[PDB]
Amino acid sequence: HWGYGKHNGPEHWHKDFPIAKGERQSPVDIDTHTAKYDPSLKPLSVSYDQATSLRILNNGHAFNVEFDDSQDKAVLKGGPLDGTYRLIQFHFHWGSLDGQGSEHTVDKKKYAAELHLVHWNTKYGDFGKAVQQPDGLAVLGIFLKVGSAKPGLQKVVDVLDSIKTKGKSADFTNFDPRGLLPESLDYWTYPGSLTTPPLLECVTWIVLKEPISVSSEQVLKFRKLNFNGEGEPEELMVDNWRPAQPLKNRQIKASFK
Numbered sequence: 129h130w131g132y133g134k135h136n137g138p139e140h141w142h143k144d145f146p147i148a149k150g151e152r153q154s155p156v157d158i159d160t161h162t163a164k165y166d167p168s169l170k171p172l173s174v175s176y177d178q179a180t181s182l183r184i185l186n187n188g189h190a191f192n193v194e195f196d197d198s199q200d201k202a203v204l205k206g207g208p209l210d211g212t213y214r215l216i217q218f219h220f221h222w223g224s225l226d227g228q229g230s231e232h233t234v235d236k237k238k239y240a241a242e243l244h245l246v247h248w249n250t251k252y253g254d255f256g257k258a259v260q261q262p263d264g265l266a267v268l269g270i271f272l273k274v275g276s277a278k279p280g281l282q283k284v285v286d287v288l289d290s291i292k293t294k295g296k297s298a299d300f301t302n303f304d305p306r307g308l309l310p311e312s313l314d315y316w317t318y319p320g321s322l323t324t325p326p327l328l329e330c331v332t333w334i335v336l337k338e339p340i341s342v343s344s345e346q347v348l349k350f351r352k353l354n355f356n357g358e359g360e361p362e363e364l365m366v367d368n369w370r371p372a373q374p375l376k377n378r379q380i381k382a383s384f385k
């Protein structure tokens with residue numbers, strides 16, 4: 129199975145997922161000097177007031193907080209997007225050390241972690257059909273740096289001891305994802321892919337410029353999770369990030385002058 133070890137990590141994925149060498153792979157380095165302000169971008173609308181979180185799952189490569197996506201509640205509209213994209217799950221990627229962990233980089237700088245809020249385009253009816261489309265998904269990416277604690281992350285941190293190993297889940301109702309956002313919605317956007325197998329080229333990426341701050345204690349609890357299942361040799365869930373991929377024939381647009 130694919131993973132993040134020496135023997136099954138990002139450099140191996142292309143053997144079972146040849147799109148790994150494709151024309152619009154993610155993540156990428158965001159060269160802030162080359163990114164261009166785009167006046168055609170409409171205002172971005174993150175509308176999470178009616179979000180319904182359900183469950184948190186250790187899937188063996190990260191943990192996902194899952195949402196009710198059976199109707200428009202938590203949605204993402206505007207910016208580069210045509211129509212309405214519904215929140216289905218969020219998850220993070222993080223490092224073994226604070227100096228790495230993000231997937232996107234900013235002028236080559238790696239953050240300690242990166243949050244991905246995953247949305248699917250409602251015109252395609254559900255997530256599975258959306259990932260057959262070049263505009264099926266929108267992922268809102270948010271960098272994490274280590275400093276002050278993020279109060280809106282603490283409920284997540286505290287449940288991780290109940291989902292230590294692959295295949296474990298827990299109830300995670302009444303969680304407000306608005307508590308994970310920075311103040312500013314300034315962003316960069318480009319067309320890309322899922323960053324994990326199957327690496328499908330279906331994503332409009334919207335990467336916020338302002339990081340959130342989380343405490344060292346918060347990210348240390350991410351690093352106590354396990355890639356393995358219960359009863360198997362313990363392999364800490366760390367360094368579950370894909371490195372930056374070639375930009376190829378793409379431009380990164382900025383929402384801000």
Ligand SMILES: OC[C@H]1O[C@@H](O)[C@H](O)[C@@H](O)[C@@H]1O
Nearest residue numbers: 164165166167378379380381
């Ligand atoms: O031909 C000029 C155009 O080139 C494109 O590559 C840029 O994205 C546009 O912003 C620019 O107006």
Ligand SMILES: OC[C@H]1O[C@H](O)[C@H](O)[C@@H](O)[C@@H]1O
Nearest residue numbers: 283287299300301302303304
């Ligand atoms: O909001 C997410 C979760 O936060 C805390 O763990 C609460 O104790 C739990 O009831 C809730 O489901």
Ligand SMILES: NS(=O)(=O)c1ccc(O)cc1
Nearest residue numbers: 129130136140141143144
């Ligand atoms: N191409 S892959 O990363 O999914 C992979 C790599 C090694 C392996 O033994 C099985 C799968």
Ligand SMILES: NS(=O)(=O)c1ccc(O)cc1
Nearest residue numbers: 281282283284285286287
């Ligand atoms: N009652 S509370 O929302 O302040 C709370 C609950 C659980 C938790 O791990 C952190 C905070």
Ligand SMILES: NS(=O)(=O)c1ccc(O)cc1
Nearest residue numbers: 244246267321322323324
């Ligand atoms: N890491 S990611 O946000 O690009 C992502 C989102 C959904 C998914 O099924 C696989 C990967």
Ligand SMILES: [Hg+2]
Nearest residue numbers: 187188189190
């Ligand atoms: Hg997995």
Ligand SMILES: [Zn+2]
Nearest residue numbers: 219221244323
């Ligand atoms: Zn991700």
